[PDB]
Swiss-Prot record:
The chain holds residues 322 to 506 of 1231 of the full protein. It is found in: Secreted. It comes from the Eukaryota. Glycoprotein that plays an essential role in maintaining a well-balanced immune response by modulating complement activation. Acts as a soluble inhibitor of complement, where its binding to self markers such as glycan structures prevents complement activation and amplification on cell surfaces. Accelerates the decay of the complement alternative pathway (AP) C3 convertase C3bBb, thus preventing local formation of more C3b, the central player of the complement amplification loop. As a cofactor of the serine protease factor I, CFH also regulates proteolytic degradation of already-deposited C3b. (Microbial infection) In the mosquito midgut, binds to the surface of parasite P.falciparum gametocytes and protects the parasite from alternative complement pathway-mediated elimination. Disulfide bonds join 6-55, 38-66, 70-112, 97-123, 129-175, 158-186. Expressed in the retinal pigment epithelium (at protein level). CFH is one of the most abundant complement components in blood where the liver is the major source of CFH protein in vivo. in addition, CFH is secreted by additional cell types including monocytes, fibroblasts, or endothelial cells. It is linked to Basal laminar drusen: Drusen are extracellular deposits that accumulate below the retinal pigment epithelium on Bruch membrane. Basal laminar drusen refers to an early adult-onset drusen phenotype that shows a pattern of uniform small, slightly raised yellow subretinal nodules randomly scattered in the macula. In later stages, these drusen often become more numerous, with clustered groups of drusen scattered throughout the retina. In time these small basal laminar drusen may expand and ultimately lead to a serous pigment epithelial detachment of the macula that may result in vision loss. Complement factor H deficiency: A disorder that can manifest as several different phenotypes, including asymptomatic, recurrent bacterial infections, and renal failure. Laboratory features usually include decreased serum levels of factor H, complement component C3, and a decrease in other terminal complement components, indicating activation of the alternative complement pathway. It is associated with a number of renal diseases with variable clinical presentation and progression, including membranoproliferative glomerulonephritis and atypical hemolytic uremic syndrome. Sulfated on tyrosine residues. The lineage of its organism: Eukaryota, Metazoa, Chordata, Craniata, Vertebrata. Residues 5-67, 68-125, 127-187 form the Sushi domain. This is Complement factor H. Sushi 1-3 domain represents the minimal unit capable of cofactor activity. The property to discriminate self surfaces from non-self surfaces depends on the C-terminal region made of Sushis 19-20. Homodimer. Also forms homooligomers. Interacts with complement protein C3b; this interaction inhibits complement activation. Interacts with complement protein C3d. Interacts with CR3/ITGAM; this interaction mediates adhesion of neutrophils to pathogens leading to pathogen clearance. Interacts with complement factor I. (Microbial infection) Interacts with West nile virus non-structural protein 1 (NS1); this interaction leads to the degradation of C3. It comes from Homo sapiens.
Length: 187
């Protein structure tokens, strides 16, 4: 009898051309295909603003007729190589922020979703702890960098014969939102 038929394609971020003429022939028989467009900021699988949707035995094809098009913005606090490039939905791009800045929080890539970039392509200043605020007697900070990013650890080594609170001859402390995890102890 009938391996039938397909209903009106509710095209997200797009629409069918000649909408008034084609409505109501629906439900539409299999094999029938219609030209459709995609709204601004969106594209067809072929990469154009218009294509053809086909009534398949398993529904409309393509299943996602209109994919988002993402525009890589300028990065004031990062290294720029893609400012102005366009990417189709599902694409992941590497993001290089300047030392001390990171993506939120903290991916190394932004992916183009249907709703736009995920996360937003912008480098935010990372919170830090200063080595100058550290205090240790009978040991020293064996690193030795001045600024530590959140969750980064500051290494310290005790003096000959002294031990930490583990009690080992060396340990570390962690940088947090509230400052250092604690004070190094070498006794
Ligand atoms: O990343 S952002 O939030 O800054 O948005 C970047 C995109 O802004 C556009 C349009 O975005 S849209 O509204 O989503 O389509 O234009 C806007 O930014 C550009 C400059 O891009 S840059 O990365 O910030 O430098 C401005 O051009 S200019 O002012 O720098 O010469 C647009 O001003 S104008 O409309 O062109 O007058 C500015 O428009 S708006 O003030 O944001 O309304 C895209 O640029 S566009 O595609 O040329 O319009 C940016 O995406 S892009 O991939 O960087 O171009
Ligand atoms: Cl930035
Ligand atoms: Cl010291």
């Amino acid at each position: 009898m009938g391996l039938k038929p397909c209903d009106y394609p509710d095209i997200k971020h797009g629409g069918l051309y000649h909408e008034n003429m084609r409505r109501p022939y629906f439900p539409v028989a299999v094999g029938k295909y219609y030209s459709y467009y995609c709204d601004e900021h969106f594209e067809t699988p072929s990469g154009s603003y218009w294509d053809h949707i086909h009534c398949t035995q398993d529904g409309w094809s393509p299943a996602v007729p209109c994919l988002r098009k993402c525009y890589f913005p300028y990065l004031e606090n990062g290294y720029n190589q893609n400012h102005g490039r366009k990417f189709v939905q599902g694409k992941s791009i590497d993001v290089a922020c300047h030392p001390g800045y990171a993506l939120p929080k903290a991916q190394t890539t932004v992916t183009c979703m249907e709703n736009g970039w995920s996360p937003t392509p912008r480098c935010i200043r990372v919170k830090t702890c200063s080595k100058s605020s550290i205090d240790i007697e009978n040991g020293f900070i064996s690193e030795s960098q001045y600024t530590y990013a959140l969750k980064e650890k500051a290494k310290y080594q005790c003096k000959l014969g002294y031990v930490t609170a583990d009690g080992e001859t060396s340990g570390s402390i962690t940088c947090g939102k509230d400052g250092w995890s604690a004070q190094p102890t070498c006794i």
